[PDB]
Structure formats: C-alpha cells, structure tokens
Write a protein that binds this DNA or RNA. Structure first.
Lengths: 62, 65, 64, 64, 65, 62
RNA sequence: AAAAAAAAA
RNA sequence: AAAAAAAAA
C-alpha cells in the first residue's frame, strides 16, 4: 500500500526507472507491469525481474 | 502472486524461446524452460537442471516473445 | 512490534537516516513513507527501497 | 509440484549431482535424502545443504 | 519458532551483555540489544540503529552469558 | 523431518560440526540446541546462528 | 566453502 | 549502487 501505488504511478506515467539489484547491477527500462513477486521491465525486451533480487526502484523524474 | 509470473513463463515454455536466466550472483544461464512450479524452474540445455527462483534475479527472453 | 514505531519517529521528526543494504551500499536520505515491505527514501528523488535488501537503518543523530 | 519428483529420481537412480550454491561453490555428491527445506548430499560424508542457499541442482549425466 | 531465539536475545537484553552481530556480508556490529521483535533488533552503541534479522548471520555474546 | 533428526543426532552424540555460511565463512563447534530459525553453536561461547545464513551443516564424523 | 573489513548513492 | 564471469567442496 506504498508499493502498489508507487509502481502503478511509474507504469501509467510511463516513467523510466533504474532498478538496482542486490548484486549492484543497474537495470534501466520501464515498468510494463508487475505482480506480487515480479516486475516486468520493458526496454529492448520485456524481462521478468524477481522482486527478491531488487534493492531499489529509482524514478528518473520525481 | 502468479498473474504475471505464470503467463510469462508458460509463454516461454509453450513457444520454446531460448532464455537467459541471470542468477543473483551474476551467473548467466541459457537454455529453454522445460517446466516450472511455484519454487523452481527446469532449464534444459545440454542437461536439464533445476533452478531455484530464490536464486534468480531476471529471466530474459532472447526473441521479443 | 518495534519496526513501525521506529521508522515512524524517524519519519515524523524528519531525521536524516543511513540505510545500509545487504551489499554494503549506504543510502542517505529521509524516510518519507513505509509499508510492510518497502521504505520510500527521500533525497534528490523519492526512491523505493525493499526491506529484504536492507541490513540496517541508522540515525545520523540520536532520536531526542 | 516438480521439485520432489525431480530430486526423488536423482535419489532412486543414485545419479551424481552438482549442487551450485548462491555464492558459486559447486558441491559434488549424490542425493541421499531431502525434505521441504534441506537436502542431504552424500560424498565423503552426509552433509545437510539448505535449499535457500542453493542456486541449481545439475545432473552430471542426463536422466535416462 | 521462538523458543530458542527469544530466550537467547532477552537474556542478552536484560543482562546488558555487549554483543557482536555479524551480518551476512561479514560486517561486524557491536553494541547492546536495546530490544527486538520478530523481524528486527535494536542495537545501541553511540547511536541506536535498527538491524533486520534477515541480514544477520550470527549474534555472538562477548561474555559467556 | 530430515532437518530435525539430522540436527538432533549431532546434538545428542555431541559431534563437532562445520557450519558454512552463505558468505563462505566456516564456523566450528557443537550444536548445543536449535529451533525453527536458529542454531546455538557452542565452542568458546554459545553464539546464535541464523539458519537463513547457513549453506551447509557438515558432520566431522559420519 | 577466508570464526567473520561499523559498512564502495 | 559494474544490463549482469554455465558457476573458487
């Protein structure tokens, strides 16, 4: 109830995100969709990102 | 809880798309999704191995689905 | 519980926090919000930190 | 489920397995036993591996 | 589920024993257990910080309890 | 039901164990006790080891 | 398989 | 905060 609103707003407004993984890798793209356990990150492809592997989701614009 | 994960993985299984599965440690695994359940994925390549989802960071399809 | 009351006070009182992640990365900012699984850390931008990736939440100055 | 049937067949048929851990360490042995959370890996000794620490279970040779 | 963890940590809290808490990444934290719940521990030293148990590998008491 | 019997037998027979953590650190000592989430490892002190941080528990003797 | 880097925005 | 070492018994 902070998580859903946050990820939906980035999905609607189609804002570019950086997704930092727990290993330090930075992923860039857009939240295409998400569910309870994964985020679909669109860029050149739609990859499935497991939330358990994510540290942070950073908006490029507030 | 399943409504994005199962469709995603079943599409890649039914259509036999080559995947990269990156692990939380950075290792890249490649093959095809033989099958899966709530906790693991069968990745077939030269051998068919069992991959724990808790160890996966991303499933990247090679072709655009 | 002890987690909510703790993060709430760092919130209400707008205290600068360090959030150390399980990989060692320190994150500076202020707690804007939180729920069961995530914290919103406010600095240049409002980013969402997953709790499972956090090792510690350290106040920069003591709480009162 | 797919996990039980898979580890059971590597067991019954006494197939050598590699168990790769989340930190990269490869473990050679045979599955002696398992439950919901742990696997017993048989080599020099019967050690207990936690599943949460496992990234993959790889057969050394294909199953039939 | 609690029958070893809570006694262990409450003893260290009530008796104010200096602890080392080693994190899963190898970092050593030192202080005293101010309090705790199911998911976190308050470690008081120069400042009182909140430590997630999922990030802890071991709690080592300095004195033999 | 493979986990409890395994850890109890090491506790009774007082067998020395190596406990390898997910970071590769090796702990040595004896299972003093355990519960659902932690193991008490006796050596010079009794430390509490979180099971989520353990990769393997290796008996020194079968 | 480093009895363990108060911690690589 | 390495768009990512088929993988340091």
């Amino acid at each position: 109830s902070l998580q859903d609103p946050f990820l939906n707003a980035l999905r609607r407004e189609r804002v570019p995100v950086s997704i930092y993984l727990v290993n330090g890798i930075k992923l860039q793209g857009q939240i295409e969709s998400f569910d309870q356990f994964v985020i679909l990150l669109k860029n050149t492809v739609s990859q499935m990102v497991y939330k358990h592997a994510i540290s942070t989701v950073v908006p490029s614009r507030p």
